[PDB]
Symmetry: D2
Subunit: 237 residues, 4 copies
Amino acid sequence: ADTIVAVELDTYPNTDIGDPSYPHIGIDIKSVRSKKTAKWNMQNGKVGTAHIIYNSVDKRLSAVVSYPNADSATVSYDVDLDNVLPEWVRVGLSASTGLYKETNTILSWSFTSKLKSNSTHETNALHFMFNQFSKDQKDLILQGDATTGTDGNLELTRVSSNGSPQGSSVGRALFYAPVHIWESSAVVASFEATFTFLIKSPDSHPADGIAFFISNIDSSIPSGSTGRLLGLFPDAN
Amino acid sequence: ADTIVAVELDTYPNTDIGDPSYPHIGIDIKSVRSKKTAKWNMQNGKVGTAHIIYNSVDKRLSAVVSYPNADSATVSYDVDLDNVLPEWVRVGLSASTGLYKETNTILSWSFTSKLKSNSTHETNALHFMFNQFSKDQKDLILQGDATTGTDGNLELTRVSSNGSPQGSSVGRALFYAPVHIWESSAVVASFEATFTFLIKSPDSHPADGIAFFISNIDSSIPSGSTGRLLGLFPDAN
Amino acid sequence: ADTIVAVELDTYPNTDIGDPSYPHIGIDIKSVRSKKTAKWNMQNGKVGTAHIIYNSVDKRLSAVVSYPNADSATVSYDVDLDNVLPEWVRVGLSASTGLYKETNTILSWSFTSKLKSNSTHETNALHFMFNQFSKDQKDLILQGDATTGTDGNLELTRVSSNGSPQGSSVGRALFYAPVHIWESSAVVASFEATFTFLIKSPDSHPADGIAFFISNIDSSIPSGSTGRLLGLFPDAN
Amino acid sequence: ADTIVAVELDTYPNTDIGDPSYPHIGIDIKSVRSKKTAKWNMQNGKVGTAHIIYNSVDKRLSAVVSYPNADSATVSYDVDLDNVLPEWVRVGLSASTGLYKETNTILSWSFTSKLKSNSTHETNALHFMFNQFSKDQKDLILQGDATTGTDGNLELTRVSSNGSPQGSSVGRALFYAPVHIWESSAVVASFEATFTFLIKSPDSHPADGIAFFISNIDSSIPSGSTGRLLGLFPDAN
Ligand SMILES: Cc1cc(=O)oc2cc(O[C@H]3O[C@H](CO)[C@@H](O)[C@H](O)[C@H]3O)ccc12
Ligand SMILES: Cc1cc(=O)oc2cc(O[C@H]3O[C@H](CO)[C@@H](O)[C@H](O)[C@H]3O)ccc12
Ligand SMILES: Cc1cc(=O)oc2cc(O[C@H]3O[C@H](CO)[C@@H](O)[C@H](O)[C@H]3O)ccc12
Ligand SMILES: Cc1cc(=O)oc2cc(O[C@H]3O[C@H](CO)[C@@H](O)[C@H](O)[C@H]3O)ccc12
Ligand SMILES: [Ca+2]
Ligand SMILES: [Ca+2]
Ligand SMILES: [Ca+2]
Ligand SMILES: [Ca+2]
Ligand SMILES: [Mn+2]
Ligand SMILES: [Mn+2]
Ligand SMILES: [Mn+2]
Ligand SMILES: [Mn+2]
């Protein structure tokens, strides 16, 4: 199956699969059952920002989610991505709705990856930044119900013309080019991702969440992965 | 056919297609017959550097080629890429040999593209940098006789195991992801490319050259592109 | 005296010193009498953006000023900065009011300078970016009535507590560190600056303008440079 | 006194002040007696590279020193710089010789600092990169015996015309502009530094070392800080 490493912004507490009883951010290493979580005071209708960082020196994947004039939620987990992910991967954003729903709108997204090898001055780097999305964004691979163009934003899940989010939706957006996330001769490897989102929902319990993920190049939405599975995993194991 | 815009480092003077009677750099807008050229004192066996720049404000495509402790060749041409190229393109490097030959080795390559839109703070950017190439470089589309891995270098054309360049060779390397080179609402669009090369022939006259090009997404080596056509054009018109 | 090279956003037409009879942007090379101008449809109370670019290859200084959902004004001028400016300079922003006034608010400012030398891979670079200013901004040299901290903005000229701009005001802000603007050994030397501003006047007819300038390291506000002189020149010659 | 935070590349083991009995890299927080060290297999006459990184999310200062075709030494230390350093500081390089000596040559140096604020898209950044130093480097504050120009290198300590390092030497180089290393409102604060050095010694026992340091803006070489104090501390407490 696909190998997934993700940072989830889980808005709906699914107690049967191990979710805390409140909105939270978590680090998922090949399983929807987060390796570590942190309470997140999600703000309905407000624009938030997520920062994901990682470096091979201290092998720690960290994430911070904040809103203006509000405290930030933080979560970290020590993990050596060399032993989890293949050398070449694709990075993307995923989101879903189930019985309950919310808009999973991405306003901007940027990513940076660097491989600084042993040889003096032998750096390989990739950097992209979208501050507005086009109707025909040829450098993104859109899967599921993901669409671009609506107000220059990226809608991961389906929203009606009147702006109402729909349930039972799932969508993803991966950057077109494969990323060389790590290599053996690298002295220092690292990546950094940032995205701003707008989760708006009429429900008392918005669902299901957004997630930044890294996967094998040919990753695709596992069947029936709407709702609690965030479009990333085929089952809840 | 393909739409090509290229900066050629022409090492062999083909007088029948308009080449000056000496090595030169030139701006090719949809034709192997350069719109403007400049004498280039090519140095066999030495590592050179090429810098290509362009911006929509003053619509001028410029290039500079230099060698350490040597003068640089420069060429410029006013051209509005909006009227020549499609919004989405692919960028790459091309090279060829014919009756005569040379090594068309690329030691490093970097590219940066930015679209500063009308909407304040709405910048879109792409940046990649290869300071060493891998045997399996999944973010490059290699066409023709192009290969990577050899000393961490990109060999656009065929070289034997003993290092000897072969004639009648043609090869290209395009970056995997499509680049949004321009758009109607962009207040400023621009790009910059840089690469270092090592051209060396054991014969009297080297041939045929290296070229940085921008083309339609699905561009492919035209048949008969060997020799004077530098793997870019189907004919000499 | 000081050596000034500036891109002015002139809001008040001073016909005696050569100003066109309308708001305009212009390139000033050591004189308040612009070498080249362009009509600018200034929008009172709206946030605009200015982009200044320059590169030694095609020796052309260009500027673009735009507002969201509006056309942009553009002006260019061929000039070899090597012959005008000293190798080391300071970059900054200047503004003034005279009999009439306006707010000269800077919301953000970024600058990038690069020197690619003859020796392969030998690049020197400087880059700063302020998206919000602090009350104690130690990396800026504030001259005249310039202050920071008010809403995280830079006020080049004096504005009252109630937000009203004052006349007869002049202020500047230079980046603390000297910039190596050019050097003889460079193959390519280039810079790019961007800033967003908010010009507003209740009197309905604003004066005098804002300007991005490059000068000798020890530059200071010439005596009596309020009004038409934009705080850059000592006289109107 | 000055507040110093430094990563030392200690070549001479001073057992009385706590040095291990071999060359090592260490994290010094306000004291020459490192908080944590790591064995470093220094290679006389070879060019090495140092990478220092830090981020406020996981508050860990890490360093890696490597040589081509050789293992790298690594050292990390959890420390919240907010509680140690003032908001505004200066960054620099320091080096010294004592009874024994070595050349403390810096071939290149780059630094990047970013303050990601709570408010969406509010980022402040500073970045400089020197790949060659000039005889008159106006953006560096040279203290002690530090000089630039010699082959486009930075010599932290005194070396004779014939290239021989001298003992009892101490020199520093700080970047001209103050750096906003942190602020309360920042969601993420981080910095990264990289430099390549060439430590060559005539004898089989080099001394004393090179260090990347962060200090209060007005920092200066302490009296009698030659040798084992690396030009950073006034005493060995
Ligand atoms: C007990 C319960 C009450 C409720 O009000 O909604 C519920 C919704 C549930 O789950 C569904 O809605 C959730 C929120 O969309 C999804 O995570 C999940 O995949 C769906 O099966 C499960 C249980 C309940
Ligand atoms: C005049 C001449 C002399 C020669 O010795 O070889 C020659 C080879 C030529 O062309 C071939 O060799 C050239 C160099 O490889 C190519 O540019 C071209 O496409 C090939 O057809 C063209 C002319 C000559
Ligand atoms: C009295 C008067 C009437 C008028 O219509 O315009 C005037 C413009 C003046 O100019 C001053 O105000 C202008 C706008 O504030 C400045 O450009 C200029 O340098 C100042 O001297 C000064 C006086 C007048
Ligand atoms: C072997 C030796 C003999 C001696 O008489 O003094 C010595 C003094 C030393 O110390 C000085 O030289 C050392 C190496 O340069 C420095 O680390 C230290 O700060 C200096 O005081 C080191 C070694 C000796
Ligand atoms: Ca859940
Ligand atoms: Ca030719
Ligand atoms: Ca005027
Ligand atoms: Ca020591
Ligand atoms: Mn969860
Ligand atoms: Mn030609
Ligand atoms: Mn004017
Ligand atoms: Mn020590």
